[PDB]
């Protein structure tokens, strides 16, 4: 089963990285502890939504710093 890696763990990957593991391991170990959530059609919209929200903040921050860069010097 596909899941999203909530907390960065060892020998698995990056925080937020999608990883497919044996479902029983996640049903007995990962999900009850709140360390993982399986990848649905909705949390893809929510993961694209938070990544694109960090991008909506980033594109504002760096562009404002570049406009102020055009103001200074």
């Amino acid at each position: 089963m596909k899941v999203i890696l909530l907390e960065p763990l060892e020998n698995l990957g990056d925080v937020g990285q999608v990883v497919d593991v044996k479902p029983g391991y996640a049903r007995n170990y990962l999900l009850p502890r709140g360390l993982a959530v399986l990848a649905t059609e909705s949390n893809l919209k929510a993961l694209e939504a938070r990544i694109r929200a960090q991008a909506k903040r980033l594109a504002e921050r760096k562009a404002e710093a570049e406009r102020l860069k055009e103001i200074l010097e």
């Binding site: 089963m1 479902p23 049903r27 999900l31 009850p32 959530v37 399986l38 649905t40």
Partner: protein, 97 residues
């Protein structure tokens, strides 16, 4: 082996037809019927427990229909579930069907 909780899977009537002889397709005489035994085919059922709203809930569902339960709970986030006993929680988790 009671009924399944989500889909309603239940044991059904079945038969076991005991056979002997060499089949026609392999070149032999043909498959015979040396007996018939009625049976009740039982579903593969386990106890999947999910902790929802700070309460431990139990479910008796077929192993193939396991992700359906986590779909129901994962989609049931819109409703307020705190304060309700595990019985009425097990009730309201089926309300999404």
């Amino acid at each position: 082996s009671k009924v399944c909780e989500i889909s309603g899977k239940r044991p059904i009537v079945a038969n076991s037809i005991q056979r002997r002889g060499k089949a026609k397709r392999e070149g032999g005489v043909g498959k015979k019927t040396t007996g018939i035994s009625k049976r009740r085919q039982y579903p593969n059922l386990q106890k999947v427990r999910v902790r929802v709203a700070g309460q431990e809930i139990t479910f008796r569902v077929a192993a193939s229909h396991i992700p359906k339960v986590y779909e129901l709970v994962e989609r049931a986030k819109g409703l307020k579930l705190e304060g309700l006993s595990p019985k009425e929680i097990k009730k309201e988790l089926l309300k999404l069907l």
